[PDB]
Design a binder for this molecule. Structure first.
Ligand code: HEM
Ligand code: HEM
Lengths: 364, 365
């Protein structure tokens, strides 16, 4: 497939097929005028309509008046849409502006402090987020970079994160991707094909108390480093004890195939799978849509790499929070450290060529 | 199709090879003083490079070993294709201050002069040796550097690394020329992998140059260049085009109509980037540029921080990067870029067969 439809009852980039690359970015609002903001959201929408179809924003990247800066920076010229999806989310701090306090959804709870947290405030939070996912990373980077240029004067970029998963051009789509620890990551997850589960664990409903979120979701972002050098020193058995599956095939303890249903009582008490399993959390279930990241080498010469964890849910208090809390005694905690965090209320979708991002929240 | 690039040859792969879509560059610093210990590491690295470039796990594998033993391969590449992985090794001038290699530091491995406008981070510059990991799959390149580093534990350390999310170079003039983050095509007039007479003239060293052990190798100049994205995106279309000498949409030289139409340099502004970099403007000095675009989060001040990891292979740095870089002192592009990291490496000749090993010509075999 080449492109994903931008319009719909929901926003693309949540339930849709997971793309290869990612450029996440959290924005901070720098304007007080609500009409100027609404105007940006419409300009941003019009630009995303062009970005997700492989076209240049505005009037184009060249050919215009020579004395005028081009509307598009043009580093996407000659590339394909690449399954580009642009998902916008509203964070708690946004609702303290424009008189939106009383409309902040109660499902957008602030995350509590979890044991072991070492969050970098500079790389945390944000008034807005754009999740740019595509098979080609330059198409993602081009979209964030142009969306930031468009909104310059009304929004800035708080933090940005590049990620990567599979290379679909060479990796089969049905092959589970492996995280940087060497384990198949994503076996037991909510797929976008399961409309009944999405209606129960991901999408927000009107009765949930916030009508303007009817059709939207709530996103949780966690930047989790991995102690690559120590993990590579643990024995194969220790490694498999941590998760409760075997590294080669990814199968649960006592089973032969990856996708067999696990038998938790055979896993060690502090195994990752055993604790994060829904049965172990009053039925809490998540849609994990994260990416691996590798930013380079830190001061101490260690690999600055990990998982950019993303999770979509119908309510943050019945999704990420119960599950993350249960991971207090995770044996994986020895080899990981959360260092970035933010949450967002992702509104419903752009219904047609007249609608615009956040039209249910800001009205018409 | 994720096919593999042959690891053996008279030269190392990753130079004249078609530019791959991802990069993981890593400079190392030698910790051990034992010359026999380092030579052994070189033979261990070479063995792992044969496995990785072929799409196989290093050592005895990623699993199946003793449950009490750590796996030889970290396993994050299992189930992936070679993805055109290349691993190119280089020796830095600081490596010759040890193991008794002083008399073998190649004269062509010239230490760069101080260029005006530079603000080089010394912690992200230099290095006793380098390993260039290029591939169409980023998890493959990373998996390669990580496992090479783990094998060299106790004998080498990573000084700095640099990941390239996208190529800004081309050794294949027949394929689409990629674009840097300034929106312009980058790699139009560059040495192609099929142009042997030019590769022999500008890239591959020779025993006549004075360093026999470097016959068949090349010399690398790495330069981390930050881009002032904010000031560039304020310029007009005509200013951006006057900066380089080519138009933006087609990439043709000024006045012309097609990207690969040869330039008429007198029609460009006297400070046009193309006009000063052209070989005709540098006594015929020609480079083999093989760089990648990079992103580094945000400057912490509300702005995306991005740039270009510039790599240049040449037969002799004194006649390649140095003269061309000096001619860009007046370059109009200088008002939008800044060089913030730098390193040079003497890339030895390639691994001939399964009995050879990286740096065998230098260290004797
Ligand atoms: C670096 C950090 C992490 C790593 C390496 C990791 C890795 C894994 C692996 C290998 C599995 C088994 C394969 C699979 O079922 O997908 C798994 C399962 C799972 N993980 Fe994680 N995980 C991390 C963090 C988290 C966090 C922070 C959460 C939630 C707050 C989470 C929630 C889950 C869930 C819900 C499952 C499904 C288990 C089941 O239902 O059987 N993970 N993870
Ligand atoms: C951020 C820094 C740079 C950018 C954005 C940049 C961009 C470009 C562009 C757009 C072209 C024209 C298309 C092409 O011929 O590929 C070009 C050509 C060229 N550049 Fe640069 N460049 C940069 C740095 C450098 C440096 C540091 C050197 C050498 C020390 C260099 C040497 C050359 C050469 C030799 C050419 C080909 C000129 C010819 O047509 O003969 N560039 N570059």
């Amino acid at each position: 497939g080449s492109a994903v439809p931008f319009h719909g009852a929901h926003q693309a980039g949540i339930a849709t097929p997971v793309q290869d690359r990612l450029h996440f970015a959290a924005f901070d609002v720098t304007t007080e005028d609500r009409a100027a903001f609404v105007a940006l959201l419409k300009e941003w929408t019009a630009a995303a309509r062009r970005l997700t179809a492989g076209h240049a924003v505005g009037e184009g990247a060249y050919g215009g008046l020579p004395e005028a800066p081009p509307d598009d920076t043009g580093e996407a010229l000659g590339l394909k849409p690449s399954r580009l999806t642009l998902t916008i989310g509203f964070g708690p701090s946004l609702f303290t502006r424009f008189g939106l306090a009383d409309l902040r959804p109660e499902a957008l709870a602030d995350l509590p402090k979890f044991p072991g947290d070492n969050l970098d405030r500079a790389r945390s939070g944000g008034d807005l987020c754009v999740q740019a996912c595509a098979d080609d990373p330059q198409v993602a980077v081009h979209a964030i970079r142009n969306l930031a240029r468009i909104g310059f004067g009304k929004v800035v970029v708080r933090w940005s994160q590049l990620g990567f998963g599979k290379t679909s051009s060479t990796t089969p789509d049905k092959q589970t991707p492996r995280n940087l620890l060497g384990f198949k990551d994503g076996t037991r997850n909510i797929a976008g094909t399961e409309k009944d589960r999405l209606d129960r664990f991901v999408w927000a409903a009107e009765k949930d108390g916030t009508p303007w979120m009817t059709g939207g979701s709530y996103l949780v972002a966690r930047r989790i480093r991995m102690h690559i050098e120590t993990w590579d020193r643990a024995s194969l058995q220790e490694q498999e004890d941590v998760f409760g599956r075997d590294k080669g095939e990814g199968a649960p303890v006592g089973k032969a195939k990856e996708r067999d249903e696990p038998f938790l009582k055979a896993m060690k008490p502090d195994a990752h799978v055993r604790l994060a399993h829904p049965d172990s959390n009053g039925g809490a279930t998540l849609l994990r849509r994260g990416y691996s990241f590798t930013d380079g080498t830190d001061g101490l010469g260690r690999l600055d790499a990990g998982l950019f964890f993303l999770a979509y849910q119908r309510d943050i208090r019945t999704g990420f929070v119960p599950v993350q809390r249960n991971l207090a005694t995770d044996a994986l905690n020895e080899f990981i450290q959360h260092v970035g965090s933010a949450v967002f209320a992702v509104p419903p979708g752009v219904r047609d060529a007249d609608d615009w991002w956040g039209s249910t929240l800001f009205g018409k």
